[PDB]
Symmetry: C3
Subunit: 408 residues, 3 copies
């Protein structure tokens, strides 16, 4: 009934208190049997949409970047985001190694530590990106095959919208229209769930605090910190550089963006903030014909915010499970995540949904008590992380639409 972000922070701050004192001389168990299931309900509602959004999303996403259905002003802004995600990934990993979130918290939940099962011959792991039956991939949660098929579909659809046959061209138009809309419904459903999130988020940390000790809160602050420093380090180290390098003034640029960022910071919605963003791009004096096209893109294809979230969440999730992870695997894991997140920029809680999808793609079964309880930690603090996530997404959309505006 009331401001949804307030609700989640209230449930979090209140929940960690309740959990923590109930932890000390309380009954970690009673929480586990009674409180926690409300939390589990929450985590179920999210993992639910993990499949439809990943697939429907990527079909739309592929079609968005798809050549040469891609316009010429478009091709440049795409090139922009690729070379920004580039840096946004490096920062992610760097900050994730810089703060070491996860080690320190050594979860062995069943009273047995989680043991990563590994891993078939390169041949078989590559071959198996190609879904043997795409309905089946989709049906029983194969991530890599769904990704591969949703790109190969999305790109194909666009080629059909370049056909002589209007029977053909309308058909494609229809399919894609319908796949979108599914995607679009899946998002509306996230909004709905975020409504339950304050109860759900409550129940989650309540348990984690009551059961994992007080150590966690420092481990989570470890996460939050690693994101937010990388986050501002992105704006400063890359955006300001790109603006400066294009004769735009970084200081006064921020002065216009100032509330467009603050809106994103508080609405979490790249789409919800889009009205405010476009109005500021007009204040900055970007061509109408430019920002009305390139801003609607960053709202969806902006990959840089998610790239920073995954960088850290990946590393913490894995680190806490026990498995110390190398730089190679870090990006392999991360690049995969970001490369499937295209089309999902905001979307309220995308950062967390992608995490689920990446774990399900790297084989870690969410049903295993450790994986679950590890994930459940980040899912608690997702709210906070998701504010910076969107805020940087928006800042980099303007930065891009401004750089590309100027070249026209």
């Amino acid at each position: 009934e009331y401001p949804v972000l307030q609700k989640i922070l209230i449930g979090l701050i209140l929940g960690a208190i309740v959990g923590l004192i109930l932890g000390h001389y309380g009954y970690a168990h009673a929480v586990h049997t009674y409180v926690k299931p409300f939390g589990d309900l929450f985590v179920r509602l999210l993992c639910m949409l993990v499949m439809p959004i990943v697939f429907a999303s990527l079909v739309v996403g592929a079609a968005s970047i798809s050549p040469a259905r891609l316009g010429r002003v478009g091709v440049k802004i795409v090139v922009y985001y690729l070379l920004t995600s580039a840096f946004a990934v490096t920062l992610g990993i760097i900050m994730a190694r810089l703060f070491n979130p996860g080690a320190g918290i050594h979860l062995a939940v069943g009273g047995q530590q989680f043991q990563p099962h590994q891993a078939p011959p390169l041949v078989h792991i590559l071959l198996d990106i190609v879904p043997t039956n795409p309905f089946g991939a989709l049906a029983n949660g194969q991530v890599l095959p769904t990704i591969f098929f949703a790109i190969i579909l999305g790109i194909a659809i666009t080629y059909l919208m370049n056909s002589e046959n209007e029977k053909v061209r309308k058909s494609a138009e229809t399919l894609l229209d319908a796949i979108n809309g599914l995607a679009e419904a899946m998002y509306k459903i996230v909004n709905g769930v975020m409504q339950y999130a304050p109860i759900g988020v409550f129940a989650l940390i309540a348990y984690v605090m009551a059961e994992q000790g007080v150590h966690v809160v420092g481990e989570l602050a470890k996460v939050t910190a690693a994101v937010y420093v990388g986050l501002t380090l992105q704006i400063l180290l890359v955006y300001f550089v790109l603006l400066k390098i294009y004769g735009i003034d970084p200081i006064s640029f921020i002065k216009h963006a100032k509330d467009a960022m603050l809106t994103a910071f508080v609405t979490r919605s790249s789409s919800g903030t889009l009205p405010v963003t476009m109005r500021v791009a007009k204040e900055m004096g970007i061509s109408e014909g430019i920002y009305s096209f390139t801003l609607p893109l960053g709202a969806t294809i902006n990959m840089d915010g998610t790239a920073l979230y995954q960088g850290v969440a990946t590393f913490f999730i894995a680190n806490a499970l026990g498995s110390h992870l190398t730089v190679g695997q870090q990006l392999t894991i991360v690049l995969t995540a970001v490369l499937a997140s295209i089309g999902t920029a905001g979307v309220p809680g995308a950062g967390a949904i992608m995490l689920c999808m990446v774990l399900h793609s790297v084989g870690l079964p969410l049903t295993d008590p450790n994986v679950a309880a590890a994930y459940a930690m980040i899912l608690g603090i997702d709210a906070i992380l998701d504010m910076g996530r969107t805020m940087v997404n928006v800042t980099g959309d303007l930065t891009g639409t401004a750089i590309v505006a100027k070249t026209e």
Copy 2:
């Protein structure tokens, strides 16, 4: 060789002829020969039905959620929705009441494999509730999870509507398309049922032929037991609730029926809420309901009218369970029944929805249709579904008019 012939006649001929053939082949006949030869024609029939059980429940619920969905729901609409909810309320109670009043099922104690069916029971409440949320909705759909499919089709249908309330025309057209295509699938699945009802006379023949030949003559009384339980609760609904609702709204019940008289008799003989809808609207005009009212509210009851199904399930549930051996309590009765009705929204008619829902409710309550008992128990009701489905639709239509008349008179604007 054209079966261009009245399809209801066909099924009743298939039924009354079939039970004779079966019954005499039973007495000094060869229950077995029937079982190996005649029955598979019956099983083909039961397959064609349980086929559509998944697409129609899903695609149907998406459309139905979207139809009741707020605030996409118009204000004339919101009152008629409230109507059907408080009528299904009563329709359910009568269902259970009549199902306990006649005791269909006990008396017939089927142990078909030569072993009695044994309900397997049941995970911790936590786990049964959590598992209503599909972990992967494609998967729910793919391998038949009922409760997760229900849950997802509602959460989808509602969401779609909210998208048709968007600024973004990209978004608004997208939603419109998806929902358009989900409908139409629903709509096609219905057209497929009509097709199957065409085979129903042969299939319904082979089904009771076996049941009679093998289950004794006890069945025909047990089935009359069902038919009765429905038809008495059925008319007891019209009298006890509709007439009270009309009387309570200054509408005259006696003269109301006098207009509805053929509109009901059409439904009773067409089994189709949609097929009868033309006749119904013309009678709503005879009763002098506003054009802008009945041309909206009647197309809804044709789909969302839940009261007829509520009575079918009430009795079929109790019989199917009772015959299996398991004596069922009043809590479970409605738990089971409310479930069924609440997923049957959007499926009013549809020729044989009564039977389809039964199959879906069983698959939802864990009873595997592959087990010989559950199968041979369902195969009984599926025979007589035809008869029951005439009263089902007739009451559906009577209560659509009752509703659209009660709501009409609260307007006149």
Copy 3:
């Protein structure tokens, strides 16, 4: 750039590949190829058996809708009857030529070091009842061919009946679902084109292995296949088309003289759709009514079954024969008739001949994962390119043959 003529690419990959393979076979390292080269071929085979499900399904829904009565126009009904009575003959030639050359025996593959063993086969009741999908989403989800076929027809036909409805809500909904299912189908074809781009690499790796490992025997066994097709192929044009034209007072000699490049385009483009512009312009040169060829040509592009019928005839026989199992005339057609009867809507489509094979094997229970089945299919898939040129060339010749026969019955020459 791999943008160079795609057919050249594949023949270069084939002729080069067989050399490389074969010499690497003799004193080479059949094994090295197996571990390193072959996986590139396997990636190819995967990419194909990938789309086998969506195309069969989405394709048959479209196909059903295209022949569906009485949505079928009257000029249409005669052309449909034409292709049915030509597929009739095309099947017989298929089998005849497959028996006449004996492709397969001579190559006795036992790959694991154990020969493949056809597992057989449930009671006729169970194999027939199981054509009806218990849950159609599941059929689709886990590869069930026969159920997918059955449901895709029963859906496509139904959708068309809905486009004959009074209710525009209904008639648009159907129009949408069918529109969307199309496009999916249409996308799946675009995806094949994409794969054929990788085909030169993939095809190289496939025969490279087969030659290196299966001996030099194969090339003769494959020439055996190519021949059987191409002789049956031309024997179709001569024995049936020319007889049909002659029988309708059209002159076969001068008919060919117009079709001459329209066939040569098809022979070189492999696409019934790609060649369709050329075809229509030639139908105009032959002086067919504009309103006739602009309708009937677009059909044979998709429903022409006669080319595929000849491919399956021979591929079936070889594939089974090589596995070890000697196959009778009954089974031959049972297997083949099935294949052709699901292939409606898939005329071209670049590599449909091979995709249908995979689908017929998955329908007849032979698991593509078994190393023999796999290595046997992997042989035809190599030479598919060659076969597929004659496939489309005969498809086109017979579309013209039909549209000219049907044209003249309207008195539109």
